Amino acid sequence: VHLTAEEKSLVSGLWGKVNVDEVGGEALGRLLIVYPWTQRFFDSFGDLSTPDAVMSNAKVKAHGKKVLNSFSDGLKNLDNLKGTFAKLSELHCDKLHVDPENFKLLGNVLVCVLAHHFGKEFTPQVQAAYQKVVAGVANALAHKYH
Amino acid sequence: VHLTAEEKSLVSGLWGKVNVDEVGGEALGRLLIVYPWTQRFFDSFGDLSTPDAVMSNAKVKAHGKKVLNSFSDGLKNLDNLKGTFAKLSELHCDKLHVDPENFKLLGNVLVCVLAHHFGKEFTPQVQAAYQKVVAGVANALAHKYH
Amino acid sequence: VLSPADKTNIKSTWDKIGGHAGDYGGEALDRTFQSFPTTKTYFPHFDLSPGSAQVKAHGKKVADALTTAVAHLDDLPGALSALSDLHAYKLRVDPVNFKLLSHCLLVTLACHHPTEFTPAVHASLDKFFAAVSTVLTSKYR
Amino acid sequence: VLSPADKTNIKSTWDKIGGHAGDYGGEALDRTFQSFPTTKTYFPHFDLSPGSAQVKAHGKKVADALTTAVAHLDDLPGALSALSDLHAYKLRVDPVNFKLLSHCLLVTLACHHPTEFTPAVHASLDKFFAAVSTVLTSKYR
Ligand code: HEM
């Protein structure tokens, strides 16, 4: 999980002006829409039956913000992704039984949303660093299967 | 990994009767036949154009044996898979750039060859143990990609 | 897509398994559940113990689905559209799990019919299960 | 799949893309190279530098292919036959890199078209890129 001293700054540069309130629920909302089998885990979240329904569902947003925080916690501690997501790996792997394929997927729709949010400021330089972060998070969250 | 006392004894049980000179080559050869796109990496192996041709390829055969031994080496080191397969990570990841997904593929078609040779006594129980062993060898190999 | 030969291979090996087929459903489910424990989650309602009569039955329902497939290779989507709607809309399986069971479908084959499980056949059966997996995940696309 | 809903979204979107299509192919390729260094390996013969004209020029040809695809959505297979052969028989591109370039093609469009890139359109485009890719790999099967 390397991320050059430039890339690390290329990442908080960007994450400084992320909209904690709207980004997280947005990526989680599109995930459910683009990979519909992922609503299996959200039986308690109310109505998800049409793209508009998902986008405005208030739990997707709320839960979405909490999930953002994990990534925030991951950006602050990049040399110890395991420890930071240790217990969070247990929840998904040992209790929710989410396939870690889907951790890759959420990360990628998160990159998309950031592209969508920052537009041209999300340079190929920047994207490639964020791919590194999302892989390590997606992967450190998948340790309880290793 | 995981690998309970029971499992470990079963996994050692089988290896002792695997054919060292033949199983490895049979597994690379089927991975070659079955996922033709893996052939990209064997441009010094001579003719691969037919299954019956791939399965007589002396080099495919002799290189399969090499792959077993690093498994034998992994099987004696379930505790330090990350270390045992450390340097082969570099080769596959820094030098060849084999996508890591094909580690998981080769492992799996090994499980098919174990299965093909053993029949009855390759119990689902045994197979589970060996997926655990395959899966860890794949992460060991994909580590520099981590 | 399945070359004519792919279908020749699929049709023969399925002939040779014959009355055995239903029972291989149960074994291949078994191996999936033991090898990848993440999968059992889809069957809370199932007794999952060793000799489970319940899995037994279901595995048979599964092989049955596959015996139908082998009789309709030129049109799977049509022949297997009920199980799509069920698996995509209602079960919301994860496409990864078809990748997994299909491996365990091969592994069972090799365990029982080593004479017919030649690499060319291994390749055509892998192609066959993947085609069945694509139809049943089709509603996601 | 490729339900008239998605076809409408792809078509509609490719339209506001306009002349910027070829330009994107280049940026998309650029993006795949930086994010997934494993991939640059198909282009040992390219300068993969910052301004590369080869990279610029290749992207036009990729962007042209996708427009042919948009123009023939009920038959991608026949439309893309020459590329199926090329990417399977000659280049032996890994099925896993269509997923990788497809993601980067999706990022490209987000970056440039913030309005059009709604969730529903984002899923439709994903279908379309997976479809194109399904067909390019179609010769390992
Ligand atoms: C890879 C990045 C991911 C991160 C950072 C993440 C983060 C989190 C966090 C922090 C929680 C706990 C919130 C709380 O309980 O207070 C949570 C819960 C949960 N996550 Fe994840 N997750 C990720 C991926 C996924 C994926 C891919 C899925 C399934 C498709 C998933 C499904 C769930 C479910 C079902 C819960 C239970 C929360 C509830 O029911 O209220 N997560 N996730």
Ligand code: HEM
């Ligand atoms: C089960 C995972 C794998 C293991 C344990 C493994 C092991 C090895 C070992 C031990 C060697 C070098 C042995 C020697 O000559 O001293 C090797 C070389 C090589 N492997 Fe792997 N490998 C794995 C997966 C793969 C895969 C999936 C591919 C391609 C798709 C691959 C392609 C190669 C190539 C091209 C070489 C160099 C062969 C040469 O000398 O030309 N390996 N691998």
Ligand code: HEM
């Ligand atoms: C080629 C692969 C598959 C085939 C041919 C297949 C076929 C079937 C059939 C025939 C049924 C029952 C039909 C009925 O009772 O009306 C069924 C149900 C079911 N399938 Fe699958 N299936 C496949 C893959 C999977 C996978 C990968 C999973 C997830 C691990 C899965 C999970 C389920 C579940 C939970 C049921 C309901 C069982 C019940 O209530 O009796 N299936 N499938």
Ligand code: HEM
């Ligand atoms: C949407 C996905 C893709 C499309 C539409 C596409 C299309 C094309 C086209 C139109 C060409 C040029 C053929 C010609 O010059 O007549 C080409 C060549 C090529 N493709 Fe792709 N391709 C795709 C994905 C990929 C992927 C994923 C890879 C591997 C990472 C790849 C590797 C190559 C290479 C190495 C060439 C030859 C470059 C040259 O020397 O001209 N392509 N592809």
